[PDB]
Design an enzyme around this catalytic site. Sequence first.
Site, PDB file in Angstrom:
ATOM      1  CG  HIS A  81    -126.319  93.511 -30.719  1.00 50.48           C
ATOM      2  ND1 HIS A  81    -127.406  94.007 -30.035  1.00 50.48           N
ATOM      3  CD2 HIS A  81    -126.304  92.179 -30.485  1.00 50.48           C
ATOM      4  CE1 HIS A  81    -128.024  93.018 -29.415  1.00 50.48           C
ATOM      5  NE2 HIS A  81    -127.376  91.897 -29.673  1.00 50.48           N
ATOM      6  CB  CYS A 108    -130.941  89.619 -28.406  1.00 55.03           C
ATOM      7  SG  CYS A 108    -131.647  90.942 -29.409  1.00 55.03           S
ATOM      8  CG  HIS A 115    -126.546  91.508 -23.859  1.00 55.92           C
ATOM      9  ND1 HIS A 115    -126.179  90.513 -24.737  1.00 55.92           N
ATOM     10  CD2 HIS A 115    -127.776  91.918 -24.248  1.00 55.92           C
ATOM     11  CE1 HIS A 115    -127.141  90.336 -25.626  1.00 55.92           C
ATOM     12  NE2 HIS A 115    -128.121  91.176 -25.351  1.00 55.92           N
TER      13      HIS A 115
END
Lengths: 42, 498, 96
Positions: free
Chosen positions: B331, B161, B293
């Site tokens: 994402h 991530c 984020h």
Amino acid sequence: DHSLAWDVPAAEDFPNAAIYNIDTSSESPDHYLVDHTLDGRV
Amino acid sequence: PEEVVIAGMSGKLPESENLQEFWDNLIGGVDMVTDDDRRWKAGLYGLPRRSGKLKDLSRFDASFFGVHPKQAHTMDPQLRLLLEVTYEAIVDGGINPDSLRGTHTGVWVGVSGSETSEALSRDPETLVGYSMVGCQRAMMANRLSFFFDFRGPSIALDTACSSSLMALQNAYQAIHSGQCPAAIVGGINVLLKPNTSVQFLRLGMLSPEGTCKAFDTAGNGYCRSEGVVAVLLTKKSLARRVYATILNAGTNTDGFKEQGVTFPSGDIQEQLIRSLYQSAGVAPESFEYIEAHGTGTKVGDPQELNGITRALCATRQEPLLIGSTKSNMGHPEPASGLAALAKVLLSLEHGLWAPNLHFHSPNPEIPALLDGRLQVVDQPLPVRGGNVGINSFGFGGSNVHIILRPNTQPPPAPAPHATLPRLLRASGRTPEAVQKLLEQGLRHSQDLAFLSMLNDIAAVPATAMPFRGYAVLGGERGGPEVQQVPAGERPLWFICSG
Amino acid sequence: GVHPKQAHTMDPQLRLLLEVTYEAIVDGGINPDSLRGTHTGVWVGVSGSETSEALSRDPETLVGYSMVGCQRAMMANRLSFFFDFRGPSIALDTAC
């Protein structure tokens, strides 16, 4: 130049013969098998 | 230490072949997270029905990259797209790749999945060994180095991530320390195995509605999305186009946490942000936009937002604009940082901020949003100025943060020599490439810098690009011309008339 | 602090590496509690996640703990978490 098409992995290419579980527990649908006893044995 | 600047960017994000379509989708308010079943049957194993996906994964120009058909069929789609995206990134900066040949450019690539390798390594009786050299994780950077002839480091990071932003940080450190003159930072993610989605769903990190609602009361989770990006970091001297300047980059891990390994922390992120903006010598009042984020998790969002509030919003009067690129496309786990970077750079270039999506009411556990110190950009807002900050946080606790100084270079003052006709030359793999380059040159005939950059990337040998063309721009007449270049060097002769 | 359910769903590399890292710190004569809260970094070189393939091969039975225990990036993140390291945590994968 994108005239040709190349291999791309498919969904079925990855991991994911019937198997039956026989359970006599009172909470299971197959509980009725307890009553099929012969010679003192299920 | 010298300056580190971003020279070129390219990518293939969801529902966008190139970055132009990505921007058209961002500013047009079009949800790039489709619900079709291209990757697999929708709803399989109870997975969310919506995900981010690319338009096509079966396209790759094998001949130009010197890959035989047998090798191409066993090459990871990530690698196939990343080669093209890297080449586009290098040219996007107006730099002929031949110049970078033989230098110490280093390729840092962030990758988290290797699903193709498993598919090709499942039949020992009929499996080819080429798959090791085409699907192995290290090859995602070593292949790029091999083709482009880069003598620098070739690493394939794996932090989850946050891999792409970690790669950008490593490239920035390498250039800033004098080890490399330029670097290629890339981030790749492709959704091919549903079992990974099942794992994420079981952990609880996926949203049943399949919509990343950043900074919103009903933030359930995040939707998986695939994408490929690549950025050419370079020093000042080499750069021809400068999107921004990397004022500082840093990283750090959360450490021990009572809640668990996957529970995000806010104090560590605040410390990282404060350390970066203190070492760089940039006051908090100079910030204008922070790319959070923004995965939409009910726990991570309050932590990140309150950390930002403590770090930056301590003593600044005007509000700080905060947005997340994950409400627009999804994402891409390993490519989250680079997607946000691409959105930020495009917004800076076009002078407008990409609006968020799925924002209706602010999260009641974030005082800044209600107080007004933090403002979510839910409408196109023209840029006033200041600095930018991008932070990507993995679920293992690997935190990254960057500070960007945009490019305030205005158009040059008109000069007498600008009216003289100028010549544009292009080369391409097929006639359509030359046609598009010539049409673009004609569209912006008054932009000298664009023409110069186009002319500086058109000196590709005839073997690689067997089609060439030219178009005398601004003249009394003369349209474009295109024709195939015969192979073999041709001597040049002079004859002086009497 | 790995519960038995998660121990079964954890890569053998991660477990052996936790043990070996604790041994390496002590061999240097430095108490591990001295480095807690510092900027110590963890770099690991891994070129394989076959445990994830073995654990994610049953969509109807897999537990989510495998991702948090068998993921490639956790081979360093787990060490940083347990030892409380605030520095970089990376998983390089350059072959050999």
